[PDB]
Structure 1
């Protein structure tokens, strides 16, 4: 007897039989070695999709520049993806866009964006993902990168008194006018660097390999920028964020009701002979065919009547994307015929060591050479991952609101790289005409629809952001399994955080109740297996159940114990919002309740109930700056006992209010309190000597 699981799809829908075909239970794919060939395929493929040869030499940068707009050499295979944007066509799509809703659209949206840039603190730059710090040329979190950047500003010339977005950006442009910048290297030697290397370094974007990406056989490289490009990108993402929130055919911030309203609305506007065919499309090479010169053209049109500050402030990040550098990873390796000795060639010596590469490496390397730096590469038309995502959706709304003038047209919905198009027409050759006109407008503007991964039907049978919609029923996003148990902090914050994740996946996704009870019992079992705690009735005898089994006769009511201390489960599906202690403190023994909840404990001293919070030991394998900075943190937190809650206002001085605060509470505790001359005069002498020592 042969056996086949997919026969389950012979009498059911695909809304229930699609989690069967997601392998989200096994191990995610990882990358290995270097991330050089992936980036060379991205850059060389980006130049290979530009369809041009017209070069303009640069007088600023020592590398050539290839133009990307309005320089087309029309090859016969136009189905191959092109990277050329017609600016008159897309500005015609901008006027055709704003003429559908309102007249003062870009002025009102640009005033809403302009209202909320001047009221932004620059610490918002530190609430991001991992960035590329150029001090040591590594990948660091954003707080350390802004730490070394602000330390470079205060180290080179003058101090920093900005505390805003605009004066920080003007400080970056002031660094672009500076002739020599001094920063710290290796034990802290202060080195200097000139002017051209600062421009070559401020436009540096690091490329690595994307780890943990489900769904590709071949790996794709991700790129993270520096810090001196980020806040202008925050400006553009706020502007385009307000534009996408104002629109009606976008789904970046409900994604379910809008398709109901466009299916129900556009099916209600048919003739007696017209009908509708929907096409699921998925744009391929979306990160290599969105040039920032089109962003420079459109963002000079959105800001035509906005201000003088915003008109100049929304045309800066597209230029830095127009002259960006691409890192090369860390090189490659070479070995002999015996395969024993293997030298490592870095990305620096790749120019000299050209004679030790494969056929594919020399095919990707000989067609990338005249755009190479000594250590980096040059790109002027790419837009990689980790960049503008809220602004290409505006292009997607522009292509899906086109007017060609019968009475045949289209509509739909756009996402990051998924689009669902609804066509309304009369006959099938006119369907060829309208679909080929959609490929015409997307192909002329610069959006390459993939032909292999696109299809369609007459009713709703489409794919959009991995949610398969049938004719009547609706599937959900396939849930990530390993996000259930990644708390790993405490005996108290592993189970309640698991119930919070089961709660938010129960409310957000479907998560049927028996599946939720099963997942709660599995996370309970790995909780009991991690911390080695079992119920008392089981015969488990390890280094913690001996004490619990020995002292079980001292506890009167047996269900008053905790799960982490030798008790069974009392939380349920209807008890996920209540932790175990608050559910069980009405049944504990008073000796047990007084015994466990002692704040005089050797484990807590040195957002749930804290009674088991221990700290594990650190590892055994920049350490002065955290010493001094955390001395400032413990000091300023010690002076102002309520300062981690409120934002620390006041920027005239810190230590003046500290000294007047120790005089304030020393005099406050003194005058109807202590009353003794040596303590008040002693603290007075220490504060005065600290002020004379500090201020001089």
Structure 2
């Protein structure tokens, strides 16, 4: 007897029979070796999508430049993706955009975005993902990269007194005007660097392999930039963020009711012969056909009447993208016929060691060589991942508010690379006319729709952001399984945090009640499997159940134990927002309650109730800067006991209010307190000697 699991789909919808077809339970695929060939295919494929040969030599950079706008060579295979943008066409789409809603649109949104840049501190640059520090030329979090950048500022010339976005970016432009920058290397020797290498290093973007990406056979390379390009991108994301929030045909922040209103609204505006066909579409190669020259052009049109600071200020990050460098990974490997000795050739010696490569590597390499640096590569038309995402959606709305003038048209909804298009027309060859005009406007603007991964029907049966929508019913987002148990901090913060995660997936997603009860008991099971705690009636005999089983006659009311202390579950689905201790302190024994909840414990001393909070041992496998800086942290935190709650205002001096603070509370505790001359005169001598030692 044969068997087929899919046969349930012969009599049911797809709103429930689609979580069957997600393999989200096993291990994600991971990368191996280097991420060099992926970047070579990305850059060589991007220049291979340029449809041009017209080059402009550079007098600033020692490498050539190939233009991308208004330089087309119309090949016959136009279904192949192109990388060319017509600028008067998209400016006509901008005037066609603003003529639909309002007149002072970019002026009002530019007054809001201009209104919310000057009141921003530059510490927002530290609240990000992993970045690329250029001091040791590695990947570090943003606090370390901003730390070494500000340290290079106060190390090379002068100090930093900015404390803003604008004076810090003007300080970066001052660093671009500096002829020589001194920073630290290795044990901290201060080396110097010239003017051109600072230019070649600040415009360097690192490429690695995207790890843990579900849904692709071939891996795709992700790129992380440095620090001196991030804040201008933050400015652009504030501007386009307010643009997308002001719009009504974007879904970057509810994503559900907008489809209800456009389906119900545009079905209310049909003729007696007109009808509607929707197409699910997915733009392929989305990150290789968005040249930042069009961002320079449109951001020169959005800011046409804004200011003088903002008009020059939104014209730097696309310029930094038009001359960006691409890292080449870490090289490759070479071995003999016996396959024993294998030398490793980096990206530096790849030019000299060209003759030890495969055919595919040499096909990607001979087509990339005249745009290579000695250690990096040059790109001027790409837009990789980790870049402008709230701004290409505006291009989606500009493609989705076109007027051609019958009375046949379209509307729809855009995402990062998914789009749902709603066409209204009369006949099927006229549907070919309207669809091929949509491919005309997207292809002329530079949005390359995949022809294999797009389809459509007459009513609502479409895909949007992995949410398959029926004619009446709605499927849910496929939830991540390993997001449930990744707390790993404490015997109290692993279960209640799991109740927070199951609570948030219950509110946000559908997440039927018995499924949440089952996942609750599974997470309870892995909690009792992690910390080796069993219920008292269970006959598990290890090094910790011996004490509990020995001392169980001391407890009168047995359900007053904790799950981390040898008790069964009392939390429920109606008790996910309440921790176990608050539910269980009303049934505890008073010797147990006074015994466990002692703050005089040798484990806690040296957002839940902390009674089991211990610290495990660190590993055994930049170490003076953490010592000095945490001396500043524990010192300034020790002076001001309430300072991690409020923002540390006051930038005139730190230690002057410290010295007047120790004089203040020493005199305050002194004058109708201590009263003894050697302590007040002694601490007075320490403050005076520290002030004369410091100020000189």
Q: Same fold (TM over 0.5)?
A: yes
CA RMSD of aligned residues (A): 0.2
Distance, in Å, in 1 between the alignment partners of 2:168 and 2:29 is 40
Per-residue CA deviations over 1:588-629 (Å, capped at 9, x if unaligned) read 000000000000001000010000000000000000000000
Distance, in Å, in 2 between the alignment partners of 1:413 and 1:532 is 51
Per-residue CA deviations over 1:15-56 (Å, capped at 9, x if unaligned) read 000000000001000000100000000000000000000000
Show structure 1 runs of 4+ deviating over 4 A.
Answer: none
Per-residue CA deviations over 1:276-324 (Å, capped at 9, x if unaligned) read 0000000000000000000000000000000000000001000000000
- For 2:336, the equivalent position in structure 1 comes to 336
- For 1:573, the equivalent position in structure 2 comes to 573
Q: CA deviation at 1:72?
A: 0.1
TM-score by length of 2: 1.00
**Structure 1: runs of 5+ lacking an equivalent:** none
Q: CA deviation at 1:225?
A: 0.4
Per-residue CA deviations over 1:612-658 (Å, capped at 9, x if unaligned) read 00000000000000000000000000000000000000000000000
Q: CA deviation at 1:445?
A: 0.2
Q: Aligned with 1:222: secondary structure?
A: strand
Q: CA deviation at 1:356?
A: 0.2
Distance, in Å, in 1 between the alignment partners of 2:171 and 2:341 is 50
- For 1:271, the equivalent position in structure 2 comes to 271
Q: CA deviation at 1:487?
A: 0.4
Per-residue CA deviations over 1:512-556 (Å, capped at 9, x if unaligned) read 000000000000000000000000001000000000000000000
Per-residue CA deviations over 1:451-483 (Å, capped at 9, x if unaligned) read 000000000000000000000000010000000
Distance, in Å, in 2 between the alignment partners of 1:102 and 1:346 is 56
Q: Aligned with 1:207: secondary structure?
A: strand
Per-residue CA deviations over 1:362-410 (Å, capped at 9, x if unaligned) read 0000000000000000000000000000000000000000000000000
Q: CA deviation at 1:355?
A: 0.4
Per-residue CA deviations over 1:96-138 (Å, capped at 9, x if unaligned) read 0000000000000000000000000000000000000000000
Distance, in Å, in 1 between the alignment partners of 2:406 and 2:554 is 88
- For 1:72, the equivalent position in structure 2 comes to 72
- For 1:428, the equivalent position in structure 2 comes to 428
Q: CA deviation at 1:439?
A: 0.1
Per-residue CA deviations over 1:328-375 (Å, capped at 9, x if unaligned) read 000000000000000000000000000000000000000000000000
Distance, in Å, in 2 between the alignment partners of 1:3 and 1:469 is 28
Q: CA deviation at 1:230?
A: 0.2
Tell me how many residue pairs correspond in the alignment: 696
Distance, in Å, in 1 between the alignment partners of 2:175 and 2:589 is 67
Distance, in Å, in 1 between the alignment partners of 2:307 and 2:475 is 46
Q: Aligned with 1:182: secondary structure?
A: strand
Distance, in Å, in 1 between the alignment partners of 2:453 and 2:673 is 80
Q: CA deviation at 1:234?
A: 0.2
Q: CA deviation at 1:5?
A: 0.3
TM-score by length of 1: 1.00
Q: Aligned with 1:326: secondary structure?
A: strand
- The 5 A counterparts of 1:378-417 are 378-417=378-417
Distance, in Å, in 1 between the alignment partners of 2:114 and 2:687 is 46
Q: Aligned with 2:166: secondary structure?
A: helix
Q: Aligned with 1:674: secondary structure?
A: coil
Distance, in Å, in 2 between the alignment partners of 1:532 and 1:262 is 55
Q: CA deviation at 1:250?
A: 0.2
Distance, in Å, in 1 between the alignment partners of 2:535 and 2:51 is 70
Distance, in Å, in 1 between the alignment partners of 2:265 and 2:83 is 35
Q: Aligned with 1:338: secondary structure?
A: coil
**Structure 2: runs of 5+ lacking an equivalent:** none
Distance, in Å, in 1 between the alignment partners of 2:587 and 2:45 is 68
Q: CA deviation at 1:486?
A: 0.2
Q: Aligned with 1:621: secondary structure?
A: coil
Distance, in Å, in 2 between the alignment partners of 1:210 and 1:486 is 20
Distance, in Å, in 2 between the alignment partners of 1:651 and 1:454 is 58
- For 1:452, the equivalent position in structure 2 comes to 452
Q: Aligned with 1:456: secondary structure?
A: strand
Q: Aligned with 2:179: secondary structure?
A: coil
- For 2:52, the equivalent position in structure 1 comes to 52
